[PDB]
Design an enzyme around this catalytic site. Sequence first.
Site, mmCIF file in Angstrom:
data_model
loop_
_atom_site.group_PDB
_atom_site.id
_atom_site.type_symbol
_atom_site.label_atom_id
_atom_site.label_comp_id
_atom_site.label_asym_id
_atom_site.label_seq_id
_atom_site.Cartn_x
_atom_site.Cartn_y
_atom_site.Cartn_z
ATOM 1 N N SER A 105 0.845 -1.196 0.000
ATOM 2 C CA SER A 105 0.000 0.000 0.000
ATOM 3 C C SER A 105 0.881 1.246 0.000
ATOM 4 C CB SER A 105 -0.972 -0.123 1.173
ATOM 5 O OG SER A 105 -2.180 0.540 0.837
ATOM 6 N N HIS A 153 -7.502 -5.832 1.070
ATOM 7 C CA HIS A 153 -6.392 -4.928 1.327
ATOM 8 C C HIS A 153 -5.317 -5.599 2.179
ATOM 9 C CE1 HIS A 153 -4.623 -0.964 1.392
ATOM 10 N NE2 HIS A 153 -4.466 -1.050 2.699
HETATM 11 O O1 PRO Z 1 -1.449 2.464 3.002
HETATM 12 C C1 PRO Z 1 -2.585 2.039 3.221
HETATM 13 O O2 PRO Z 1 -2.734 0.920 3.773
HETATM 14 C C2 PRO Z 1 -3.748 2.938 2.811
HETATM 15 C C3 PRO Z 1 -5.069 2.184 2.755
HETATM 16 C C4 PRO Z 1 -5.947 3.066 1.799
HETATM 17 C C5 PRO Z 1 -4.969 3.854 0.917
HETATM 18 N N1 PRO Z 1 -3.642 3.478 1.454
#
Ligand code: PRO
Length: 258
Positions: A80, A237
Amino acid sequence: MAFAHFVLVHGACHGAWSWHKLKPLLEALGHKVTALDLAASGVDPRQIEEIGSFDEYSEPLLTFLEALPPGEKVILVGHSLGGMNIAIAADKYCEKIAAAVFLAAFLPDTEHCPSYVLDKYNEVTPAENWLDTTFFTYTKDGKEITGMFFGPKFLAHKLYQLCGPEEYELAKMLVRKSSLFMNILAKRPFFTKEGYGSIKKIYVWTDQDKGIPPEFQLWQIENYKPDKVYKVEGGDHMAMLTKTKEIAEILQEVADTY
Ligand code: PRO
């Protein structure tokens, strides 16, 4: 199997603890693994208001890499926002980087300003998607900086939606304030083709990331074609938690290749 030294780099509001499922599996396969807290992350003793730039936010990674003994190379793994940190790191210490793995990460390039992929991300991300995330401002070294702090519903719905309640509880207990340093990144020197552009780059994209959706991950690939691409199906995620074994298999292949 080749033995590698992986350096795992978390994303916004998170910490080395994000890697707590993957790191033991990589070590069991026989690799060396380092999982760092970035500045003001995890249990690092600084608060985000002491951090004045993305380069300071990256200090633990740069400090670690400066202490690597000569001849040692590492495979960077960034998740991320962690993709930004490994760009900063490759541009100072590219001679120490065997390869950089981008795990559903931001993948900056050398042609446009460092904040380019973060700018594109914000233009295509509806503001409603941040749910209960809190945004805040502070001033450091003379600059105003906007930070963010993921809230429980954002975490639940956008980042952890395929994780059990025992991992989600760890997020509520441990997430801390962070920042994208976006205006600081707007005035930053570009990433160099000699440094960051030289190192070999692997992108692993996830098909159910509701924080960084797959279409944006694929756009990043098109914008800056990496040497190899992999797909993890069924990863949210937090794919190092929901697809740990898949990612370890990928990282073994990377270590076997670079
Ligand atoms: O670095 C992260 O985990 C965040 C999550 C949403 C956008 N970036």
